[PDB]
Design a protein around this ligand. Sequence first.
Ligand code: MET
Ligand code: MET
Ligand code: MET
Ligand code: MET
Ligand code: MET
Ligand code: MET
Lengths: 241, 241, 241, 241, 241, 241
Amino acid sequence: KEIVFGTTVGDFGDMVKEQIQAELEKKGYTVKLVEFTDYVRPNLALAEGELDINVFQHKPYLDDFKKEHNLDITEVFQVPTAPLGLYPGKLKSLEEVKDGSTVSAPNDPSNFARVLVMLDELGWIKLKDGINPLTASKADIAENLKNIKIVELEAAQLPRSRADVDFAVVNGNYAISSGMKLTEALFQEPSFAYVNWSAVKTADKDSQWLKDVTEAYNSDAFKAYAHKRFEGYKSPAAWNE
Amino acid sequence: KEIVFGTTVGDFGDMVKEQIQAELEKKGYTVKLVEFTDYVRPNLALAEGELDINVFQHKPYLDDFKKEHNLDITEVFQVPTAPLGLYPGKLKSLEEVKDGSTVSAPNDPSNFARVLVMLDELGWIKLKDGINPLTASKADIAENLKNIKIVELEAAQLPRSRADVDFAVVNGNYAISSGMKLTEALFQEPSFAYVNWSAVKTADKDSQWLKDVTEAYNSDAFKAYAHKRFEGYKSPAAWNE
Amino acid sequence: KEIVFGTTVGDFGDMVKEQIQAELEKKGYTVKLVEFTDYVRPNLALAEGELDINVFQHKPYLDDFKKEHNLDITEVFQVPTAPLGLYPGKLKSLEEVKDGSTVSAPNDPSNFARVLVMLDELGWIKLKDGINPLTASKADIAENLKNIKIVELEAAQLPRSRADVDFAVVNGNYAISSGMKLTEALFQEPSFAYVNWSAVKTADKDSQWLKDVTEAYNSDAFKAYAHKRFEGYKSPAAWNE
Amino acid sequence: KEIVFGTTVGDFGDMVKEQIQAELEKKGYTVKLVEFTDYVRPNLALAEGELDINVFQHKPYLDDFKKEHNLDITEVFQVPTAPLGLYPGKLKSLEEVKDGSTVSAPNDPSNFARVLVMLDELGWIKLKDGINPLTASKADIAENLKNIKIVELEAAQLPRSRADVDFAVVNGNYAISSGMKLTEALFQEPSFAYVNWSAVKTADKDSQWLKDVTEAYNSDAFKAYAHKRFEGYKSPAAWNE
Amino acid sequence: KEIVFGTTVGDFGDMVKEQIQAELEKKGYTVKLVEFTDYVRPNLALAEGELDINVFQHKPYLDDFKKEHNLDITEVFQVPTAPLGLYPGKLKSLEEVKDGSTVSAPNDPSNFARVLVMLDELGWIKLKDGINPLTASKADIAENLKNIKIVELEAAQLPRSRADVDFAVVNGNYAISSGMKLTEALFQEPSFAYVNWSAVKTADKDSQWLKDVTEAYNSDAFKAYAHKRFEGYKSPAAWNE
Amino acid sequence: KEIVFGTTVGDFGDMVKEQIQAELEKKGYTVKLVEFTDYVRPNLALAEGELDINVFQHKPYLDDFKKEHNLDITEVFQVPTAPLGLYPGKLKSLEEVKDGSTVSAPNDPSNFARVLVMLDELGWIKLKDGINPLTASKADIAENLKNIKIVELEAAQLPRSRADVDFAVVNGNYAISSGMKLTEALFQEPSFAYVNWSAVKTADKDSQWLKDVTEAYNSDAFKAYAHKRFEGYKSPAAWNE
Ligand code: MET
Ligand code: MET
Ligand code: MET
Ligand code: MET
Ligand code: MET
Ligand code: MET
């Protein structure tokens, strides 16, 4: 039985090659890894049969993506996840924010929402009462207190954008793969709602191979490796640590 | 030199296999064709180096997609294109439309705009004066004259949607591959703004292989085949007829 | 398991890409399609294991080919099939036939027989009594009533031959892929003996994958698709329609 | 042209996926990465043609390996390299070393030599005067001052060996991929003679593709990435830093 | 450039794997070998494209086969060939032949001819005057002097036939691979007309890869290897030895 | 079940193609053969899963190899084996040996040991009393009686080395596949300790397929074939001959 994984470049792929693959080969499986630069192809490849499982996204992204693209896919288990941070760009500290400061943000709706929530936590904008934080959008801004100019970019552009904007809100996987350190962030997202999940075609939910993959990502050996290899990452809720 | 084409399923892939491939093999090329079900993967595969050229989209789609996804790709030449039509669903004629009739529409922005423009041409809604039809959005509706309920679906769902809605606005490539006939449309888009284009990475624009592909799609032999094989399609503007 | 289909270009490949592939992907298979422009390679590719199944031929062709070339292959199920027609070449109606008129025909024995049977049905030649129609050959001609000159060509060349002969007898798959319409035929073969069959290696006849492929080609969904997409095609006998 | 890289798992593969691949795609290449868990397979895969280039070894290893196995391969350029360290096992500090303490070491000759040189620098053994440090062997030990018991293992076993020996000398690539941190080493190899090299078949040494690969590994952008992503690594001599 | 060879099992395959493949890999080709148990499939696999070159037949076989099966293939160069022999079966010497003795023979026409010519040379039958020896058939027998019963079998069955017939005429390639020694023959065919040839698709006759294969089969190194690996074999006429 | 064999080129591969494969195909298996020209790749391919079984080595080689590379593989059954020989190089007879004569030898330790034992049996060197012949090394030489210069090479180079040294010690498989004859050896190793073994992954040792393979290599039919095809080979101990 060959299990084909798709991940983004970097940390999630290293998990497969450095730990999970050997655990699954012990049980008789072969393992293939396909890495993707972007957040858009992996669910489509999964749904079209080119992958058996992907590991790259949080559940708000998945729920939105599979509804919009009408994909019969579902989350399975969580994985250690590099958290979201607001990082110094042309400006190096939060106190330096000015009226009109620029903040770069990913341009897809579920990750853009995270930026609006962070900016509201910082007091730089104010969101309307009673909104759904997972779908926060420009229409939900009650007042742009500091007249922040939000510069929307494709997610992979955010590390580079630090040259062009005062502050950059950078997804963890792209921060790590560009050599950014999580400790460089001026403000980290407090939420745990965006710890990432693996996803499969719904038809494969009860499969023996997926049971064995799930066990591999929850073993004592994997937890010990993850705590050493991926310091500062947010853990699966089920690890209850 | 191997040229790798990406197209949607059906008509654009048949152009390659039935006519273009042999023309290019005469000049010493080998040809590979990858067919895609959806409109989202092809430009990303092209930009990431897995395809040399794709043939599946119109320029408003390309312009929106390459901006949103930060892709260094560009259009080259036009191809015969199945036109957009409003087709009978539960209701069989335009005169049967009622207050509250349901119309299915694709859920991506550049193709959704075409449905709003079509409904305005039919007099079922009224768009605000002076808005750009290429970016028509719900916000641009001045009055929903017949209180049309627009049912937004992923584009490939639109042929099957005819079972569930009064009328379906169906993209030509999906209509044709589902066995729908262009002559069954109750109304066809009169614009030529959406005749489809091939697309390449910008770095390849001056290549000899692309010159040879361009010539293949503009040869007397290809035109003679296309006029017979794809009756009722909109021809490239440059074909001049 | 990946199922590798081989078909001729055009209609039989579109059946795979537009309908069968998705049905099989729902059951966990992946699908690869290889398209051929000729009639000789597909059964050789099948027998050598480069294909698991091919869809391109009728049973008289298969019976003759597998015996001549010592191939351990066998038919499985029938598929909707474009019929054989006599089409206008230099002359545009049957009534214009003259003594010595030229008719192009395929040069392989089982398809050539079909042309002799057609010419006898038209009253342009007279075949001997009591012959096997599936193997009709020049020796079976009792009288060449109109002194027809039969121009034998490789089957793929028959659309192009219309410039050189008075009438062309063209196999449906090549007529469709060259942009000819079945309704343009001056006369269509009445027989149902040439509805095409899938073929596999005999060793695979009892496989689960082949059972699932057979089911996909006999489903209500495929039948509904075929009746819309391939109007005028001759149906499998087992569909009993 | 497709360039096939072979690397060990982890850091050298991440260099390809996170930085080098995109640099080469801008010049028109596609890139394939094959990752290995051991030190023996990659040069064999290179010599057989499965790989165009590998990145996993130092030159003393390569010189020995290509001579012993009569392989027509050669080094090209250096890459940032995780250094060799002596790490705590059952004992946690250098001055806890006792008479008879166990030290695990790789069992291949060029890497075993490094352990003997390290033990001499620590004063735990004394090597003979005037030896070749690159081929230091047990015969070159003048006195085993602390009666160290050297436990020889296949190199990939050395991270796990920390449970069984007092101290473990672990190659950097395996340390990193097991979640060990370079700052955890009690003593790091001073030498720069084991900064790793890419290798190719000698027949390819003058190729354009290799020139482009070499440029990609010496670009300002790669150096900036490497200094951030791989802190504490030893740099190519040619970088002159 | 991947050169795919097809051979029968045994000696001709060993030539490729032991000597030719390395000669071609030095020049940068890759090589694959497919082996076949029978004489019918290899030319079909060559014609279909699976093979680039085959080595298994003599020219009378090829001339007959490509005409009968309508294949556009051609001979290129000769190879050292195991000769044809009449071997002991139930009877152990030629002098033991009796009226009615049974002789097994291959059942394909060009190899059956060789048996008739051999039986005529032995004085067991008498062929008619002025016949073409390459096409000698039962119709060409003037008198069956010893009323030999010729038992026609598939060529591969002839080594095993020795249990069932008085004498067996066995093709060299099958003799060698069944553990028979050429010195065991009671009578060996004198002719050199059946020294075997490589064959290719005619389209490939002027290719550079074929020039390089031809050189490998005619080098001083290959001749030295063949003279002792294949003792008793008949050499290419062009070697003029 | 498809059983994948790996062998060195030549004799061990012919055993599979000419006898074993058909014996296993009669029980319903399919068989694939991968041939190697070196001694290092086959156990690595076995351990990685590319092969199910290999046939190329003796047990002293296997024991050393699996320990050095920490591979979980094990021997199963013996096979007829071409013996080790000392062959003429620049000198043609044993009596011509001189002080300083050169003898080429394989450079791997378990095969090098065999050379030293052979040279001691010949009286050209003198090994120390009582040393383990399986691990004989240069340090076990008491006196180099004839000041032999031993030229160590990778094993596959040893046939060609005959141009450069006075005498060459060549492994049987390489002697056969280079067109050397075993009967032309000046001295053949008499020991039976190096009759070769098949090897598998330890996890497969109790499999049904391996039981069927073992039976195939010990059948009366295989023994009869081997004694004809491989004259002068050393037989498996289990054959009790
Ligand atoms: C594709 S959704 C974003 C995933 C990314 N790893 C994150 O946690 O921010
Ligand atoms: C991806 S944009 C839509 C393309 C489609 N062929 C059309 O013309 O409607
Ligand atoms: C290869 S036999 C001919 C097949 C063709 N599709 C026909 O029905 O005429
Ligand atoms: C294969 S030689 C050892 C290579 C390893 N990356 C090191 O620098 O220690
Ligand atoms: C396929 S023709 C027969 C070939 C065989 N090698 C022979 O020389 O007898
Ligand atoms: C790989 S160990 C050497 C094997 C060789 N066939 C021999 O018996 O000498």
